[PDB]
């Protein structure tokens, strides 16, 4: 399959030159692929930035430009600004199909970095009476707005039954997210310890609880 | 100024049909193609196809051919996306975007939710152990709910998280952080309204 890949996330201070890239799994990107770059802001506000490799959409600031870098398409922001914190998606016209990359979260630091505040909640007695048990992990005040969340039950990594929201912006311009682990009451009774582990900027914050 | 304005959010049952409009202004409608794009929740974008606005000839991506169709009302500068025989997996935000080549100007998006769920009020569960409390707003349909704390008297340190759509029903949580000297000394209560079911429930948070 044609798979288009981009950096997952990049962080910069204002004023730096930042370069995002867009690769095809099946071959080189050339001007025949008419590479597009689009920006998503909250919420699902999309703006076209570049089309046809290097054509700036009129009205887009001059600091944005597109080019090719080796085998890949590239978006360069020459002097990043805090308003450029967004998700950037590329699209390539490849084998006569438009294929989108997975997006790159770009953080352009508007304030100091901030580690997540993590709270883990056990299922309520009320919920357990319905024979279900949901644990809730709340994650607030983090910046950059990029985290990975993992759950463990008695040490075992959980691979099923957990849902995490995409980070969203708080009123103080940090980010928050929540994660859920959904179990049966029978599962809840069979296990002792429960943990929510949030990794942010290479460090993990873990909160745990015991059923008993 | 070029603007693409789409119709409002849709909630439909599987097997039904949805129609989304995209009204263009600021340029001559027939001089550029219109593309359609799907973005399923939390995922990246998929190209549905384009329609030539001069000839009316569409081009469809293979993965969308069949249930997805494009039409035009040219005299009104409107393009339409029709989805027939809806499936749960069609739940996504849909965007129109003008050529080109590619995706130059974008509509604001139209959320389409496909669910067989009946209108369902949430079950509201207390989240208990500065101290952070919360309420779990579980298994409601459709969106939205509103959550307040102590009838709006507690506003500082409140966070209400985005919903997850699970087993055709929504779940979200809200939290509030209060001085630990202040709870459980005084009562903290989450008030949850679900306009679609016309319901409101209060849940006082007690130590677990």
């Amino acid at each position: 399959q044609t798979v288009v890949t981009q950096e997952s996330a990049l962080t910069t201070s204002p004023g730096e030159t930042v370069t995002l890239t867009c690769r095809s799994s099946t071959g080189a990107v050339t001007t025949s692929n008419y590479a597009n770059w689009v920006q998503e802001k909250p919420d699902h506000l999309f703006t076209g930035l570049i089309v046809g490799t290097n054509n700036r959409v009129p009205g887009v600031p001059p600091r944005f430009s597109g080019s090719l870098i080796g085998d890949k398409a590239a978006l360069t922001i020459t002097g990043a600004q805090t308003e450029d914190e967004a998700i950037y998606f590329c699209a390539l016209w490849y084998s006569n199909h438009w294929v989108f990359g997975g997006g790159t979260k770009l953080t352009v630091l508007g304030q100091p970095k901030s580690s997540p505040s993590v709270t883990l909640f056990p299922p309520s007695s009320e919920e357990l009476e319905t024979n279900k048990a949901t644990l809730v992990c709340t994650i607030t005040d983090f910046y950059p707005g990029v985290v990975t969340v993992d759950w463990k039950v008695d040490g075992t990594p959980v691979t099923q039954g957990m849902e995490t929201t995409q980070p969203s912006k708080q009123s103080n311009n940090k980010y928050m997210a929540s994660s859920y682990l959904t179990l049966t009451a029978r599962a809840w009774e069979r296990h002792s310890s429960y943990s929510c582990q949030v990794t942010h900027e290479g460090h993990t914050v873990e909160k745990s609880l015991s059923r008993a | 100024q070029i603007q693409l304005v789409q119709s409002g959010p849709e909630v439909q049952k599987p097997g039904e049909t949805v129609r989304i409009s995209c009204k263009a202004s600021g340029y001559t409608f027939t001089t550029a193609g219109m593309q359609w794009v799907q973005k399923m929740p939390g995922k990246s974008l998929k190209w549905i196809g384009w329609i030539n606005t001069r000839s009316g000839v569409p081009k469809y991506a293979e993965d969308f051919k069949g249930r997805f169709a494009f039409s035009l009302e040219t005299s009104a500068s409107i393009a339409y996306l029709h989805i027939n025989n809806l499936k749960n997996e069609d739940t996504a935000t849909y965007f129109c975007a003008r050529e080109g080549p590619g995706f130059v100007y974008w509509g604001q998006g139209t959320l389409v939710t496909v669910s067989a769920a009946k209108t369902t009020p949430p079950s509201v569960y207390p989240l208990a152990p500065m101290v952070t409390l919360g309420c779990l707003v579980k298994g409601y349909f459709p969106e939205p709910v509103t959550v307040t704390w102590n009838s709006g008297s507690l506003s500082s340190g409140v966070h209400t998280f985005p919903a997850v759509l699970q087993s055709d029903l929504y779940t979200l949580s809200s939290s509030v952080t209060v001085p630990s000297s202040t709870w459980p000394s005084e009562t903290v209560t989450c008030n949850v309204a679900h306009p679609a079911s016309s319901t409101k429930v209060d849940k006082k948070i007690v130590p677990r």
């Binding site: 025949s32 | 193609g33 001069r54 081009k59 050529e99 080549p101």
Partner: peptide
């Protein structure tokens, strides 16, 4: 480049 067959 090889031409883009869309309406531009």
């Amino acid at each position: 480049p090889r031409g883009y067959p869309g309406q531009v």
